Structure 1
């Protein structure tokens, strides 16, 4: 039986590699989005070598004392999730999960000796993201669903802003809200939904990409902008030379002249230039599309003239530029050359994408999981990848301090001393102070800021 697993994290900060999770929530459902089984909710105990981002806490209303009280350790946290995620024929999804939540999962698994990717493909599993779905439905097939406007008068695709606009900040509350919004797009606009669902697989999306012929495609993405209904026509120039999942798209709705005039070396420097300091010179209308990140791509005619007129996209302008691009192969020679160019971090936590782990290293990490916390140091394993030891020490020191001998306790105590420096704690203290002014007339916020300081004391 195929299933849908709607999830959402509530974390202590924006960096999934560097910030710890506070709460996880998830519900199992079926093809028609009907609840299977009971809702899964649990909290993660943050280790004693970390302090949360206050801004992230203020948003959540979840203190470290709460998570520490109600929750379990990150190794168990990583287990309970991996158990739910391993279940075969499961499609794991949420609201903007690919850009964030997934990245958490990957790290959590990476830090706790679980494979960081298997869950997204093994045993007929998959992942999906309902952000660009909502962004598509509005831009292509808006009938039947209400769309917010704000004081700016542009479409807001914030979950809370969508639920309230159609009559519907807790982790579990966000999941339901995600389901309701799925149901809402399914029931009202099922023909689009299914298309977006079946084309979540990069291997499917491939079918749309005819690079030599440069077949124009309808791309929906935030990076375009709300004023364009997050939508435009794009023509694939070429595959990314090093990265295989990336493909180089040229925006047909935009000034192409920079591509013809300026040479690669220039176009590059021009590509990575801020909009502020960029004067009268036009920006390079080129973006990468990452097929493995579930990007919305469809064929031109999916975007109908009337919709292009509603959104404000001069079809003709897109049709012209394509003729010129097809007329100027040298543009492809110029563009690809941009992306063929070649400052890593020391912190093992941040070394996820350094490379895949070998099979041998994999098995050993399966043995590390099997072996009891106390019996790990005795387990004289010969690893190949240098990250695994550093991961293993931190894994033990964070989740099972009781297993540490005096030297390891000293080495850890040093590591904590290197993190919690007087100036870091001063910066944190004044960051906390500032905020307590900024929300001076908010007792709920203050009470938290006091808990952050109280936490910032006792743990060091």
Structure 2
């Protein structure tokens, strides 16, 4: 039988490729989300070349020390996660996971000699994200479920706010599992209150399932939901697919039909290209370019035209007319599509860890890495295999120097400290201080928080 898999991370920072993980959580589930298997949780040892960015530690409450003690080396952290995720017929998911938690999962596998995509592709493996489903469910069919309004009075879509607003427990928040359960809790709330909707979002999660909606030459008007539209509009507005992104066929070029199209008609690409790369403030007394890219491969909420009903669009405030007129004009303008699609025809990182998306690895290397996966820590020095990619030869030096310091050789050991020297440069460390200071000054009142700010400096000493 096919299964879901609700997972969650706790990291030492936002950026997946640079900031490292700290904790993991996961639960296997059936077609109706009921709890199969043993709840799995590990910790990840932070290597001797990285300092957690305070903000992460303050909100997680998880110090590196704790992780160094409780946790396994990143290789095992990967392996153990890879082994859960490689299970066939699985829909691996979480909250914001596609935007975040999964990326980490990629960079981990990338770092530790694995396929960072296969886990959500090979042997009938898919993925999903409830965050969009919440926004959608509020936007279109909010019957039954509660949604919390903020200070100003706009709907929140935090897990911590949605849980407390739906009876689900979230004492001990930002605790790997506590989320993973409270994450499942919502799926059963959406399959209950609007399975009508749920199955729609679900079945159309896959790439090939989305093309059904996207009619490009004729520009069929679809309903879309992203946080990018913002809470003020209920994260919703109709869109018309102009074209497939020139340099990235995983992206479709859409038009916000709720906005003011005229710029598209009354400017050239090189201005529009400036006007959409213009920020929300310095676009002064003008209109904003109502264009956006929807990425098909990222479980986007795409629905059929009439899905959004007059009962809903009135509740929200989106102006049916404007979107139609604008469509009429867009279909009556076969050159809007000309420049807009030109815009996206203008095309680099230095650190190997962030060098994930430099294409893919050739079948020659795919083997060569899988063979490095066979080699026991002993023989990594010994084995002679040729590599096409320059990224691997680098990755292998780090891989050993973090996960297996015992394997290091007299020279390597001193190259590693010379790396650590280039990493931990005086002023760079000073920053860390200024930050810790400023924060402890900010969070001076609290003792339990400061307790961490202390520990991070303690860590920042001994590690250096």
Which is worse superposed, 328-337 or 369-378? 369-378
- Could you report, residue by residue, the CA deviation over 1:96-119 in whole angstroms, capped at 9, with x for unpaired residues? 000101100000000000100001
Q: 1:162 Cα deviation (Å)?
A: 0.6
What's the counterpart of residue 418 of structure 1?
A: 422
> In structure 1, what is the Cα distance between the partners aligned to 2:90 and 2:54?
35
Q: 1:17 Cα deviation (Å)?
A: 0.2
Q: 1:123 Cα deviation (Å)?
A: 0.4
Q: 1:257 Cα deviation (Å)?
A: 0.5
- Could you report, residue by residue, the CA deviation over 1:44-97 in whole angstroms, capped at 9, with x for unpaired residues? 000000000001110000000100000000000000000000000010000000
- Could you report, residue by residue, the CA deviation over 1:332-356 in whole angstroms, capped at 9, with x for unpaired residues? 00100000111x1111000000110
- Could you report, residue by residue, the CA deviation over 1:383-406 in whole angstroms, capped at 9, with x for unpaired residues? 001000100000000100110011
Structure-2-length-normalised TM-score: 0.98
Q: 1:150 Cα deviation (Å)?
A: 1.5
Q: Give the alignment of 1:105-120 within 5 angstroms.
A: 105-120=105-120
Structure 1 segments, 4+ long, off by >6 Å, are none
Q: 1:172 Cα deviation (Å)?
A: 0.2
Q: 1:433 Cα deviation (Å)?
A: 1.2
- Could you report, residue by residue, the CA deviation over 1:268-327 in whole angstroms, capped at 9, with x for unpaired residues? 011100111111111110000000011000011100011000010110110000000000
- Could you report, residue by residue, the CA deviation over 1:220-273 in whole angstroms, capped at 9, with x for unpaired residues? 000101011000000000110110100000011111000001011111011100
Secondary structure of 1:390's aligned partner: helix
> In structure 2, what is the Cα distance between the partners aligned to 1:231 and 1:64?
40
> In structure 2, what is the Cα distance between the partners aligned to 1:294 and 1:2?
19
| Alignment counterpart, residue 434 of structure 2, candidates 430, 435, 452 | 430
> In structure 1, what is the Cα distance between the partners aligned to 2:424 and 2:270?
43
Q: 1:374 Cα deviation (Å)?
A: 2.0
Secondary structure of 1:123's aligned partner: coil
Q: 1:37 Cα deviation (Å)?
A: 0.7
CA RMSD after TM alignment = 0.6
Secondary structure of 2:302's aligned partner: strand
> In structure 1, what is the Cα distance between the partners aligned to 2:377 and 2:352?
21
> In structure 2, what is the Cα distance between the partners aligned to 1:298 and 1:49?
46
Which is worse superposed, 215-224 or 274-283? 274-283
> In structure 1, what is the Cα distance between the partners aligned to 2:342 and 2:381?
49
Secondary structure of 1:15's aligned partner: coil
Structure-1-length-normalised TM-score: 0.99
- Could you report, residue by residue, the CA deviation over 1:13-43 in whole angstroms, capped at 9, with x for unpaired residues? 0000000100000001001010001100000
- Could you report, residue by residue, the CA deviation over 1:204-227 in whole angstroms, capped at 9, with x for unpaired residues? 001101101110000000010101
| Aligned residue pair count | 459
What's the counterpart of residue 397 of structure 1?
A: 401
What's the counterpart of residue 219 of structure 1?
A: 224
User: Unaligned stretches of 5+ in structure 1?
Assistant: none
- Please tell me whether residue 457 in structure 1 is matched to residue 440 in structure 2: no
Q: 1:124 Cα deviation (Å)?
A: 0.3
- Please tell me whether residue 346 in structure 1 is matched to residue 350 in structure 2: yes
| Alignment counterpart, residue 249 of structure 1, candidates 254, 260, 268 | 254
> In structure 1, what is the Cα distance between the partners aligned to 2:141 and 2:443?
42
- Please tell me whether residue 123 in structure 1 is matched to residue 123 in structure 2: yes
> In structure 2, what is the Cα distance between the partners aligned to 1:29 and 1:155?
29
- Please tell me whether residue 277 in structure 1 is matched to residue 282 in structure 2: yes
What's the counterpart of residue 295 of structure 2?
A: 290
> In structure 2, what is the Cα distance between the partners aligned to 1:361 and 1:269?
40
> In structure 2, what is the Cα distance between the partners aligned to 1:190 and 1:387?
45
What's the counterpart of residue 321 of structure 2?
A: 316
User: Unaligned stretches of 5+ in structure 2?
Assistant: 169-173
- Could you report, residue by residue, the CA deviation over 1:404-447 in whole angstroms, capped at 9, with x for unpaired residues? 01100000000001111111111111211111111111111111
- Please tell me whether residue 161 in structure 1 is matched to residue 166 in structure 2: no
